[PDB]
Design a protein around this nucleic acid. Sequence first.
RNA 1: GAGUACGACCACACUUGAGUGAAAACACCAUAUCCCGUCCGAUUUGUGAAGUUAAGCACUCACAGGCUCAGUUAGUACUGAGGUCAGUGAUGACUCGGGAACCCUGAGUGCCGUACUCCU
RNA 2: GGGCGGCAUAUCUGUUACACGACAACGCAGGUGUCCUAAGGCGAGCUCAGUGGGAACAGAAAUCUCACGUAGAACACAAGCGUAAAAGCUUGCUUGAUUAACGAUUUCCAGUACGAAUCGAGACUGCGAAAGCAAGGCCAGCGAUCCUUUGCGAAGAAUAGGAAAUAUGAACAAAUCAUACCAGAGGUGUCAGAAUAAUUACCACAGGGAUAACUGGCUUGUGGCGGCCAAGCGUUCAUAGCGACGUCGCUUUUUGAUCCUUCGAUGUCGGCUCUUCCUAACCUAGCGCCGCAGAAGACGCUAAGGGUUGGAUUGUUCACC
RNA 3: UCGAACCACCUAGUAGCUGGUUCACAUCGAAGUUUCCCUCAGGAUAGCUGGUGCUAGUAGAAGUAUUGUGCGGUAAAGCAAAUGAUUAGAGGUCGACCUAUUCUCAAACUUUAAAUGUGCAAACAAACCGUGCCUUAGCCAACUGCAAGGCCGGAAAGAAAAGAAUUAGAGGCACCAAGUGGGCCUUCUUCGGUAAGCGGAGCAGGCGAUGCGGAAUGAACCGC
RNA 4: GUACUUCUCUCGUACUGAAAGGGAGAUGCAAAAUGCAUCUGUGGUGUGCACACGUCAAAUCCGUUUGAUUUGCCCAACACC
Lengths: 197, 97, 54, 158, 68
Amino acid sequence: GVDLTGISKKSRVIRHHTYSTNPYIKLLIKLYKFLAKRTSSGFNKVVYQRLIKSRSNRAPISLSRIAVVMKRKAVFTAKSKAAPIAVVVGDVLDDVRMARIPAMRVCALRFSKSARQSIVAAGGECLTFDQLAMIAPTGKNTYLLRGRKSGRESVRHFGASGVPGSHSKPYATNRGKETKRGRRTGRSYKRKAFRHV
Amino acid sequence: VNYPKKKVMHCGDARCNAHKSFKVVQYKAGKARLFARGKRRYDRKQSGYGGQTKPVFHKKAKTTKKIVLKLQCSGCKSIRQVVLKRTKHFELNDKKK
Amino acid sequence: PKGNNAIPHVHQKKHWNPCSSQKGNVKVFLNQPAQKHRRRRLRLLKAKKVFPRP
Amino acid sequence: VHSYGYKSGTRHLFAKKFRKHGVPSVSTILTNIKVGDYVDVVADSAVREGMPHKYYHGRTGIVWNVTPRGVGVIINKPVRTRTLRKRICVRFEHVRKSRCQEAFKAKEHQFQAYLAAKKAGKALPPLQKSSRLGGIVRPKNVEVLARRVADYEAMVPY
Amino acid sequence: AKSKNHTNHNQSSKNHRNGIKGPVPLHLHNSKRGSWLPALVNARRVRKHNQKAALKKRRERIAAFAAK
RNA sequence: GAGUACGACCACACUUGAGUGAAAACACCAUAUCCCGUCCGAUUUGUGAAGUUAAGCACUCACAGGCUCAGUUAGUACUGAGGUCAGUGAUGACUCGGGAACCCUGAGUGCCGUACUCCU
RNA sequence: GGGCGGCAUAUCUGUUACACGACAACGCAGGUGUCCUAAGGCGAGCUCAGUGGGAACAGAAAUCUCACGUAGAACACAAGCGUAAAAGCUUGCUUGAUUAACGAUUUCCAGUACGAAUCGAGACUGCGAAAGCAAGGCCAGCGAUCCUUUGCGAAGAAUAGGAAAUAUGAACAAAUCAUACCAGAGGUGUCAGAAUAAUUACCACAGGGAUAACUGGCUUGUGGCGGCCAAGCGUUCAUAGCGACGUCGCUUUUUGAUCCUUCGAUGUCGGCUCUUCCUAACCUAGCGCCGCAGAAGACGCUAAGGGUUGGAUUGUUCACC
RNA sequence: UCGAACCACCUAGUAGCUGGUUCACAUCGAAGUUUCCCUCAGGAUAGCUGGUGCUAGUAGAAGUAUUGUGCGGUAAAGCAAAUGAUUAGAGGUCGACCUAUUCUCAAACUUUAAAUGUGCAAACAAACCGUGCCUUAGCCAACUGCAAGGCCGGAAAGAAAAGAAUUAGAGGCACCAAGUGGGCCUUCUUCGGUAAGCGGAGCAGGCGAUGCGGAAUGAACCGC
RNA sequence: GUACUUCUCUCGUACUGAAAGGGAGAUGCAAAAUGCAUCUGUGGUGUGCACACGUCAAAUCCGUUUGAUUUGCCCAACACC
Ligand SMILES: C#CCOc1ccc(C[C@H]2NC[C@H](O)[C@H]2OC(C)=O)cc1
Ligand SMILES: [K+]
Ligand SMILES: [K+]
Ligand SMILES: [K+]
Ligand SMILES: [Mg+2]
Ligand SMILES: [Mg+2]
Ligand SMILES: [Mg+2]
Ligand SMILES: [Mg+2]
Ligand SMILES: [Mg+2]
Ligand SMILES: [Mg+2]
Ligand SMILES: [Mg+2]
Ligand SMILES: [Mg+2]
Ligand SMILES: [Mg+2]
Ligand SMILES: [Mg+2]
Ligand SMILES: [Mg+2]
Ligand SMILES: [Mg+2]
Ligand SMILES: [Mg+2]
Ligand SMILES: [Mg+2]
Ligand SMILES: [Mg+2]
Ligand SMILES: [Mg+2]
Ligand SMILES: [Mg+2]
Ligand SMILES: [Mg+2]
Ligand SMILES: [Mg+2]
Ligand SMILES: [Mg+2]
Ligand SMILES: [Mg+2]
Ligand SMILES: [Mg+2]
Ligand SMILES: [Mg+2]
Ligand SMILES: [Mg+2]
Ligand SMILES: [Mg+2]
Ligand SMILES: [Mg+2]
Ligand SMILES: [Mg+2]
Ligand SMILES: [Mg+2]
Ligand SMILES: [Mg+2]
Ligand SMILES: [Mg+2]
Ligand SMILES: [Mg+2]
Ligand SMILES: [Mg+2]
Ligand SMILES: [Mg+2]
Ligand SMILES: [Mg+2]
Ligand SMILES: [Mg+2]
Ligand SMILES: [Mg+2]
Ligand SMILES: [Mg+2]
Ligand SMILES: [Mg+2]
Ligand SMILES: [Mg+2]
Ligand SMILES: [Mg+2]
Ligand SMILES: [Mg+2]
Ligand SMILES: [Mg+2]
Ligand SMILES: [Mg+2]
Ligand SMILES: [Mg+2]
Ligand SMILES: [Mg+2]
Ligand SMILES: [Mg+2]
Ligand SMILES: [Mg+2]
Ligand SMILES: [Mg+2]
Ligand SMILES: [Mg+2]
Ligand SMILES: [Mg+2]
Ligand SMILES: [Mg+2]
Ligand code: NA
Ligand SMILES: [Zn+2]
């Protein structure tokens, strides 16, 4: 025998196939699996990994977020160079809080109907991942983007709300209930809002 | 325990903001009202058949009570309550030993 | 163990379930399509009787 | 029987050394403690104000807070499967400046001095040679190592 | 019927299976909350000015890049 | 080579006897109207300068007691790891490592700062 | 086992505890539910316990005086630690034992409360010439929800709820009344907190060999049986016979200790009957030795082949005749 | 059928207790411990375990060393050192009392004091250098001095040489949950007990959950 | 069953307070007890995929790839404000 204590703890949960039943997702995975192994680009490898990911791990992105980070890169970019193609492995959703956006080329798995209308009306173009593979096979001049997930309600519930320093929402259908003892100093004690780590 | 009849302490009222002489009086609980909300609920619960509807405490263990003092500022007439440690014999004595 | 869950208030502590010893207290809607057809049939029958009144 | 109070089992821990009793000296009072310093948390039994708990006695940590009479020290403490960074509040008399980085600080300063000397035509000190190498040995005196009869009679008392 | 009162047997083995994790580094979770207030208040004034300096500095860099 | 004031470390600086002490200090010392405090100008406080190194103080001495650093005690006591080692056992030795303490004995008997002053 | 007892039920000191921390027992030795307007705070002076010398009545011990005195005293109460121009004693003035914007932390620990602490920021102060020192007496001395009860939201200003006027009783106003928000107090000692007397042999159920009573098993304190040494006893003479003070064993025919097996069951004492086995040998076969004349006996060795009774009383085993 | 008859019903009454619980292979794989509970045959709660992953694949690594730098009062030793215990002479009618030492000791005694341990550090968000620059209602009588947050530069055996580390050395972050919460045996340490295949602990291995090869035979011994 | 419809209802886009009741952008200029101006914009800082500029090392079938690193922007996240 060989002493291999805790060797199984070194292994990691790595998925190679997708759980998706979408045939067009499988076509994209087939296309970008080929590109991630026959090209040297790091963009194709990252895109291929994100196509295998679950829906929860492909958070959607707002149109205002794309335009903001595009402007942060538009400055400090030479006028000779064209703007990169924004690529997100996920959904692009419209944002009613920002009406005036520049013309951008956006590639995404799915566009909401309003988001596609807003991109086109600004002079931009909504791209498709098989179109991207033909104009940027190695991902040259692209802006890979991810949607936000820290604001999800599931994340806001994670952890115990009764321990000091915690601010997670409890699981409760009634908002008025679960507010008296343990939440106010007058009723026995209050859960401490801050704790040094 | 012997306690002075007058105490000079800080009066936090906006018209004093200084150390003033306070008259010392032991706190005594007031009478239970008949029309306090909990009393009204208790009387409604106790009516009719069913006997004693609430617990009645019996296993007394303490032999003392915490001492509470009502201190009244001479000028503002406001009252402040302070808590002393438990004692078996609390006495207000101006005569220093 | 229990874990972090909502405190349940599902009620259902009465004799609602029909079984032996309990008639139950339930109401299903398996007759909903048939009653919907009947109501439309009755409305069309009534219009013929009161014709030409609205 | 046995109890677990704040100062339980500290009969020898919180005691002065023999003939070394007394309150802290002036040099302790004049010592400057800054945020980010390394300090050893050694309780002074003659100052029964702001003493650390007996666990933190003999632990070295990093100062995170300085207050008119007190020092905030972050101390690692293993609990079950992890180590927590515990912040303790003590008076200044219970902390000593730690020399735990003295060898590392000297190593850095030697490198700077060597670099400056090498930069501008100075003679570097000669490199020390290993003592484990071979060589010829000329013995001035040679003695016989043996067990004698006298050795056996010398270990018998009475 | 009496049972065992207490033992620490197997506990160190359990605590080392997923190992005893090291402490968080000093540069993380270095909150100043609860520290000496007079120094905390003064540090906030400097940090507020530093943010204003950072905002202005990016404005100069953007103009300088557009200058060429 | 010394003194004074403030000191750092806090006996190699302490304790007991004995001797010596330039200068300038320090100190004993004189006194009680005022400031002040006491049973008592003893201590303390004020005002002084006639006297004295007699004490304090500083040095030096002692096969001095302590204390400090070494050596011995001693690779001893103890101890981490090992044996299908010895022994009925009590226990012990062995192998790879670590390693004391008192007694006893040798040497030593403060040191380092800031300011002012004497020697000058 | 349970019961009775006690409390190891909440909690403090020393030790067990194996020189970080942590560690059990109905382990060991002791504590806690209080006490204190000072026994809290501060400043200043002083030095304690004990000795030795001396002083009318005065002595072992009354008070006065001089030396010595590292704490050998004291600091409410257990213990440890700490402390000498103090942390002890005396004294003078005091209320830092108040308030303290939900600051942070430690101990227990799930890194939750509670109780105790620690480091702070603000107000008003007490002492001090001042640096400073104090928000109790360092470390044990205490309490959730609901309910009850108390304090705080003074008066006067605002053309409009504002930077600053507590709120509600939901059609609207006034005055009561009742609520609400914040901080305490009345208590749970089974001390993270039900409101609780017996009996059952007339008894019942679910279970437990997690747990007693009976057989076995481990142990052998106790019981029983023996050795070794040799003070004495034996007129004399330690050892014919035996053997104090000690010490080393064996046995499982006594009791105790334990709780491994059995609680969906291993039929409980005694006797009767019948067989077999052991030897630490009563008789029977040999043989030594003697305080061995004989007779009768004592002690010892080899040997379990053979034998080891009839009755009164008692259920008895034992016991006694 | 009687210390509360019989018949039907509520009633499939409740049971922390006893019994049962139906196919295969594969990848992983425990716990009998903590805290709270009218809690002790049971639960919650951490820990151990699986699944799902997330994140820039050597990153904030380590049940191990070395070198520096801290902590300690057990083994030992000592009583000719404090606190307790204690035998005997000697030196200053009998003794007492002093002075010196001497026979023997301590879980709740110690001057001293290990071995084994235990905390921290050993250059990539860091540290070092330029009285370089900005800011502050911070400190100081002020200041170019200290404190703090930054900015701009410089240098960086990326850590030499002296025995001068090594790694089957991808670090961090989550989510959802199961069983378990009767243990037992050995090595050293160790408490009660005359002792026990007895009761109770510390460290670490092991059985439980595991066979195989050996000690004839044996859950735990030896080897593996 | 399938096809069709809803000025509704519900869960969210806003949360706080016991309630009366209030109710969240950035930058600049400035300090008005409701201050002004502008609207293509991550509030700031540290660590941070890809991508873009380079710059080294190794290997190349000489086309490149495969590691490291500088600078810019940094997505998602984490930590201080
Ligand atoms: C009263 C009394 C003491 O005497 C006894 C006598 C018999 C028993 C029965 C047990 N003997 C072994 C098994 O455990 C049980 O067997 C059975 C058939 O139940 C218990 C105690
Ligand atoms: K208001
Ligand atoms: K049975
Ligand atoms: K015979
Ligand atoms: Mg959100
Ligand atoms: Mg679990
Ligand atoms: Mg559980
Ligand atoms: Mg859940
Ligand atoms: Mg029926
Ligand atoms: Mg100890
Ligand atoms: Mg100690
Ligand atoms: Mg047992
Ligand atoms: Mg148990
Ligand atoms: Mg003189
Ligand atoms: Mg003289
Ligand atoms: Mg230890
Ligand atoms: Mg310990
Ligand atoms: Mg006093
Ligand atoms: Mg004093
Ligand atoms: Mg508390
Ligand atoms: Mg207390
Ligand atoms: Mg105090
Ligand atoms: Mg006091
Ligand atoms: Mg106290
Ligand atoms: Mg105090
Ligand atoms: Mg209590
Ligand atoms: Mg309890
Ligand atoms: Mg009868
Ligand atoms: Mg059974
Ligand atoms: Mg049993
Ligand atoms: Mg039997
Ligand atoms: Mg026996
Ligand atoms: Mg027996
Ligand atoms: Mg039994
Ligand atoms: Mg039977
Ligand atoms: Mg059976
Ligand atoms: Mg039978
Ligand atoms: Mg025989
Ligand atoms: Mg025979
Ligand atoms: Mg026979
Ligand atoms: Mg009948
Ligand atoms: Mg149960
Ligand atoms: Mg079963
Ligand atoms: Mg496996
Ligand atoms: Mg039990
Ligand atoms: Mg069970
Ligand atoms: Mg069971
Ligand atoms: Mg010993
Ligand atoms: Mg010794
Ligand atoms: Mg002694
Ligand atoms: Mg000891
Ligand atoms: Mg490696
Ligand atoms: Mg058990
Ligand atoms: Mg919301
Ligand atoms: Mg509202
Ligand atoms: Na089992
Ligand atoms: Zn007043």
